[PDB]
Write a protein that binds this ligand. Structure first.
Ligand SMILES: N[C@@H](Cc1c[nH]c2ccccc12)C(=O)O
Ligand SMILES: [Mg+2]
Length: 456
C-alpha cells in the first residue's frame, strides 16, 4: 500500500530558497512553485521518478518508456492513477505527485480548433515532472516538510537522507531557433476591429487579445526569476527548468484548486498599486470596485466560471462566497472573487480540466466561440501563455495557476506575452498600449538581470 511518509523540521525561508538554488544546479530537470508574497507553501521538485510529455496526440512517460495516442492528460491520468495514495491530513496540500504545465494548446483536445496560428515554439501540450520525494516549505509555520513514498523501516532512512541533503553546507553558486513575426501595432489594431465586429454581430461579449515580444537571452533564466521574484513577487510564481526550455512565471492568479470535494476558482477583476496609508488603499480599491464598466466585465466572467464549475459540481452547489474582495500584498492590490462548488462523484482530474481550462479571464465569454476567434486572429500559438502551471496529487487533489506575467525561454530567446480585454467600445490604440504596459515587469526583470551580469 503506497503512502507518503514525512518529517517536519524547523527552517528559515532564505535558507530554503538558497539551498534549493545550490541543489538545483546539478538537476537537468527541476521545478520550484514559490509563494513569493501571499501564499502558504513553496514546493521544491529536484529528483523526478518520471517525466511526462504530451504533444500533438502522443504522450511519452519515462519512469522504462511508455507511450499512447490521444488526449495526453487522459493518457497521463490512466498511468498516474496506478500510483494513487490516501491523503495524510498531517501533511501539506501537495504531498507528492506531478508538477508542470498545461499549455493553452491543451484546449485543442477539449474543443475542435482550426490549425491557423503557427507553432514556432514547439511547447509541449502537457509536461509533468513526477515526484515521490519533495520538500514543501510552510511560510506560516517556518517548517520544511520532507516527504517520500513507501510500500516504517525504509521510510525514516529515506527521510534522514532528504534531511541531510537539505541541511548539508554546499558551496556558493558560480542553438538559435527560427521564430515567426509577432503582431505589429497595426496587426493587433486590425484584430481589435475584427473582435468589435464579432461583438456587434452577437458572437462574443469580450475577447482577451495578446501580443508576443522576444529578446535574445544573455543571462541564465534562474537569474531572471530571482530578479522578477524580488521586484514583482506573487503567490503563484514558478521556475521550471528542462534542457530545451525554461519557465519564469510571476502569476498572481489561481485557475482551480481541489481539496477533497471542494472546487475553487479565484478570478481577478483588476490589480492596482497600493497607496501609503490604509485610507488611501480603501479609496484606490473602491475606484476599481465602483467602476460600473469593470464591474460588469467581471460579473460576466464570474458567471462564466460558475457555468464552468457547474459542468462537474453537484447542481445548486456552485456559489460565489467572495465578490470583489481586496487582496493586498507587497506594493499591489487585487480585486478578486471566489467561486466554489462540490465535486460530483464520477468526475476526475481530467473532467475538472475540460470544464475550467483555459480560464475564462484569459479567453472571454462565451469561451468556445472566443477561442475560435483568438485562433483566427493571433499569428502564433499561445503555448504556455494563459495555460496553467501546477500540481496533481497522488491523493487526487490539484492546484493550477493561470500563466500570465511569464517569460518562456527557448532556442536562445526570452518570449514575453501580454494581452487586453477587447469589448464593444474598445479603442484599438488604447488596447495596444494596455497590453504593452502589462509586459513592463518582464521587460524590467530582463533589463535588471542583464545589467547585473555587466558588474565586474
Ligand atoms: N501559492 C500556493 C503554492 C504555489 C506556489 N506557486 C504555484 C504555482 C502554481 C500552483 C501553486 C503554486 C499555495 O500556497 O498553496
Ligand atoms: Mg478594458
Amino acid at each position: 500500500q503506497r503512502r507518503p511518509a514525512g518529517k517536519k523540521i524547523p527552517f528559515q525561508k532564505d535558507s530554503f530558497l538558497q539551498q534549493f538554488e545550490k541543489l538545483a544546479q546539478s538537476r537537468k530537470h527541476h521545478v520550484l512553485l514559490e509563494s513569493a508574497r501571499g501564499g502558504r507553501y513553496s514546493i521544491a521538485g529536484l529528483d523526478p521518478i518520471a517525466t511526462v510529455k504530451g504533444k500533438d496526440g502522443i504522450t511519452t512517460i519515462k519512469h522504462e518508456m511508455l507511450f499512447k495516442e490521444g488526449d495526453p492528460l487522459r493518457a497521463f491520468h490512466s498511468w498516474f492513477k496506478t500510483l494513487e495514495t490516501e491523503t495524510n491530513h498531517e501533511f501539506p496540500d501537495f504531498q507528492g505527485g506531478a508538477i508542470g504545465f498545461l499549455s493553452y494548446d491543451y484546449a485543442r483536445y477539449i474543443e475542435n480548433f482550426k490549425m491557423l496560428s503557427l507553432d514556432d515554439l514547439e511547447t509541449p501540450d502537457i509536461y509533468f515532472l513526477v515526484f515521490d520525494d519533495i520538500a514543501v516549505y510552510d511560510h506560516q509555520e517556518e517548517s520544511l516538510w520532507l516527504i517520500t513514498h513507501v510500500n516504517q523501516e525504509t521510510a525514516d532512512v529515506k527521510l534522514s537522507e532528504l534531511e541531510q541533503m537539505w541541511l548539508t553546507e554546499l558551496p556558493a553558486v558560480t542553438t538559435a531557433g527560427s521564430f515567426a513575426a509577432p503582431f505589429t501595432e497595426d496587426g493587433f489594431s486590425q484584430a481589435v476591429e475584427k473582435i468589435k465586429q464579432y461583438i456587434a454581430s452577437g458572437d462574443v461579449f469580450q475577447v482577451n487579445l495578446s501580443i508576443r515580444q522576444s529578446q535574445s537571452l544573455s543571462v541564465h533564466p534562474y537569474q531572471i526569476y530571482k530578479t522578477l521574484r524580488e521586484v514583482n513577487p506573487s503567490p503563484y510564481m514558478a521556475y521550471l527548468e528542462t534542457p530545451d526550455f525554461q519557465i519564469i512565471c510571476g502569476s498572481p492568479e489561481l485557475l482551480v484548486s481541489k481539496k477533497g470535494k471542494l472546487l475553487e476558482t479565484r478570478p481577478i477583476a483588476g490589480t492596482r498599486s497600493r497607496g501609503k496609508t490604509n485610507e488611501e488603499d480603501e479609496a484606490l480599491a473602491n475606484e476599481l470596485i465602483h467602476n460600473e464598466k469593470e464591474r460588469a466585465e467581471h460579473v460576466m466572467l464570474v458567471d462564466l466560471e460558475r457555468n464552468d464549475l457547474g459542468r462537474v459540481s453537484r447542481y445548486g452547489s456552485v456559489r460565489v462566497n467572495e465578490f470583489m474582495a481586496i487582496e493586498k500584498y507587497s506594493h499591489v492590490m487585487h480585486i478578486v472573487s471566489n467561486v466554489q462548488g462540490e465535486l460530483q462523484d464520477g468526475y476526475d482530474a481530467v473532467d475538472i480540466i475540460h470544464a475550467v481550462f483555459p480560464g475564462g479571464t484569459i479567453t472571454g465569454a462565451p469561451k468556445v466561440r472566443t477561442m475560435e476567434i483568438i485562433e483566427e486572429l493571433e499569428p502564433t500559438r499561445r503555448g504556455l501563455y494563459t495555460g496553467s502551471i501546477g500540481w496533481f496529487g497522488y491523493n487526487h487533489d490539484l492546484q493550477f495557476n493561470i500563466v500570465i506575467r511569464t517569460i518562456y525561454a527557448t532556442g536562445g530567446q526570452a518570449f514575453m506575452q501580454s494581452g487586453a480585454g477587447v469589448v464593444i467600445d474598445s479603442v484599438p490604440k488604447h488596447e495596444y498600449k494596455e497590453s504593452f504596459k502589462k509586459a513592463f515587469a518582464m521587460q524590467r526583470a530582463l533589463e535588471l538581470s542583464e545589467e547585473e551580469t555587466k558588474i565586474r
